[PDB]
Amino acid sequence: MSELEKAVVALIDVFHQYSGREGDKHKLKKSELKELINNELSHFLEEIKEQEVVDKVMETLDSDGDGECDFQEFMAFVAMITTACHEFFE
Amino acid sequence: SELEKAVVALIDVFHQYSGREGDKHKLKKSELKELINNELSHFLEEIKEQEVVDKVMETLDSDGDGECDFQEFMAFVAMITTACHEFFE
Ligand SMILES: *c1c2c(OC)c(OC)ccc2c2ccc3cc4c(cc3c2[n+]1C)OCO4
Ligand SMILES: [Ca+2]
Ligand SMILES: [Ca+2]
Ligand SMILES: [Ca+2]
Ligand SMILES: [Ca+2]
C-alpha cells in the first residue's frame, strides 16, 4: 500500500484496538478515549491526568450524545488535529 | 506511534499533490486525479475519464471554489475510512 493507504488503514486499526477493550466493542468509552490519547497521541496532545479533562474531551467529541466516541466521531477528532497541523505548516 | 504517523502521512500526501500546480495549498482537478490514481489505487477504481474527475470534484468541493482544500480532503479520507469500518460491522 501507499503511505496514504497505510494511513487510512491505521486509523481504522487504532480505533478498533482501543474501542474493543471494554463495553461496546465499536465505541470508545472515557477510559478508552483517555488511553488512546495518552499512548498514541503523546506528541500532539498533553497527557490527560484529570477526570475533568477526559470529561471535557469526551463532551467535545460526542456529537450524538451517548457518552462514548464512535468511529465517525473519532474521524471528526482526527480531522481537527490534522487540519490544525496542516494550517500551521502550510 | 502508528496514529501519529497516519496524521503526518495525511498532511504530507495532501501537501505533495496540492503543491504541484497553481495554489500550492489546494488540489485542482489534475492534482486530485493523480492523488487518487497513484495513492488510493487499492481502494478506489482508477479514474480514466474527465467526466469522473469532474463528478468527484463536484462531490468533494463543499465551498465551490473549484478545488479541494485540506478540510475537503479530510472529509474525503473520512468517507473512505468510515466506509471501510462500516464494512466490518
Ligand atoms: C479499509 C481497508 C482496510 O482497512 C482496515 C484494509 O486493511 C488491510 C484493507 C482493505 C480495506 C479496504 C478495501 C477496499 C475498499 C474499497 C473501498 C473503500 C475502502 C476500502 C477499504 N478501506 C480503506 O472505500 C470505497 O471503496
Ligand atoms: Ca469500548
Ligand atoms: Ca457518541
Ligand atoms: Ca495545487
Ligand atoms: Ca474547495
Curated annotation (Swiss-Prot), chain A:
<dbReference type="InterPro" id="IPR011992">
    <property type="entry name" value="EF-hand-dom_pair"/>
</dbReference>
<dbReference type="GO" id="GO:0005829">
    <property type="term" value="C:cytosol"/>
</dbReference>
<keyword id="KW-0479">Metal-binding</keyword>
<dbReference type="GO" id="GO:0048168">
    <property type="term" value="P:regulation of neuronal synaptic plasticity"/>
</dbReference>
<dbReference type="GO" id="GO:0036064">
    <property type="term" value="C:ciliary basal body"/>
</dbReference>
<keyword id="KW-0964">Secreted</keyword>
<dbReference type="InterPro" id="IPR028481">
    <property type="entry name" value="S100-B"/>
</dbReference>
<feature type="binding site">
    <location>
        <position position="66"/>
    </location>
    <ligand>
        <name>Ca(2+) 2</name>
    </ligand>
</feature>
<dbReference type="InterPro" id="IPR001751">
    <property type="entry name" value="S100/CaBP7/8-like_CS"/>
</dbReference>
<dbReference type="GO" id="GO:0043025">
    <property type="term" value="C:neuronal cell body"/>
</dbReference>
<feature type="binding site">
    <location>
        <position position="22"/>
    </location>
    <ligand>
        <name>Ca(2+) 1</name>
    </ligand>
</feature>
<feature type="domain" description="EF-hand 1">
    <location>
        <begin position="13"/>
        <end position="48"/>
    </location>
</feature>
<dbReference type="GO" id="GO:0008270">
    <property type="term" value="F:zinc ion binding"/>
</dbReference>
<keyword id="KW-0106">Calcium</keyword>
<dbReference type="GO" id="GO:0048156">
    <property type="term" value="F:tau protein binding"/>
</dbReference>
<dbReference type="InterPro" id="IPR018247">
    <property type="entry name" value="EF_Hand_1_Ca_BS"/>
</dbReference>
<keyword id="KW-0862">Zinc</keyword>
<dbReference type="GO" id="GO:0097490">
    <property type="term" value="P:sympathetic neuron projection extension"/>
</dbReference>
<dbReference type="GO" id="GO:0043123">
    <property type="term" value="P:positive regulation of canonical NF-kappaB signal transduction"/>
</dbReference>
<dbReference type="GO" id="GO:0005654">
    <property type="term" value="C:nucleoplasm"/>
</dbReference>
<dbReference type="GO" id="GO:0045666">
    <property type="term" value="P:positive regulation of neuron differentiation"/>
</dbReference>
<feature type="binding site">
    <location>
        <position position="68"/>
    </location>
    <ligand>
        <name>Ca(2+) 2</name>
    </ligand>
</feature>
<dbReference type="GO" id="GO:0044548">
    <property type="term" value="F:S100 protein binding"/>
</dbReference>
<keyword id="KW-0963">Cytoplasm</keyword>
<dbReference type="Pfam" id="PF01023">
    <property type="entry name" value="S_100"/>
</dbReference>
<dbReference type="GO" id="GO:0019210">
    <property type="term" value="F:kinase inhibitor activity"/>
</dbReference>
<dbReference type="GO" id="GO:0005576">
    <property type="term" value="C:extracellular region"/>
</dbReference>
<dbReference type="GO" id="GO:0048143">
    <property type="term" value="P:astrocyte activation"/>
</dbReference>
<dbReference type="GO" id="GO:0050786">
    <property type="term" value="F:RAGE receptor binding"/>
</dbReference>
<feature type="binding site">
    <location>
        <position position="86"/>
    </location>
    <ligand>
        <name>Zn(2+)</name>
    </ligand>
</feature>
<keyword id="KW-0677">Repeat</keyword>
<dbReference type="GO" id="GO:0001726">
    <property type="term" value="C:ruffle"/>
</dbReference>
<comment type="function">
    <text>Small zinc- and- and calcium-binding protein that is highly expressed in astrocytes and constitutes one of the most abundant soluble proteins in brain. Weakly binds calcium but binds zinc very tightly-distinct binding sites with different affinities exist for both ions on each monomer. Physiological concentrations of potassium ion antagonize the binding of both divalent cations, especially affecting high-affinity calcium-binding sites. Acts as a neurotrophic factor that promotes astrocytosis and axonal proliferation.</text>
</comment>
<feature type="binding site">
    <location>
        <position position="73"/>
    </location>
    <ligand>
        <name>Ca(2+) 2</name>
    </ligand>
</feature>
<dbReference type="GO" id="GO:0005509">
    <property type="term" value="F:calcium ion binding"/>
</dbReference>
<keyword id="KW-0539">Nucleus</keyword>
<feature type="binding site">
    <location>
        <position position="16"/>
    </location>
    <ligand>
        <name>Zn(2+)</name>
    </ligand>
</feature>
<feature type="domain" description="EF-hand 2">
    <location>
        <begin position="49"/>
        <end position="84"/>
    </location>
</feature>
<feature type="binding site">
    <location>
        <position position="19"/>
    </location>
    <ligand>
        <name>Ca(2+) 1</name>
    </ligand>
</feature>
<dbReference type="GO" id="GO:0005615">
    <property type="term" value="C:extracellular space"/>
</dbReference>
<dbReference type="GO" id="GO:0042803">
    <property type="term" value="F:protein homodimerization activity"/>
</dbReference>
<dbReference type="GO" id="GO:0007613">
    <property type="term" value="P:memory"/>
</dbReference>
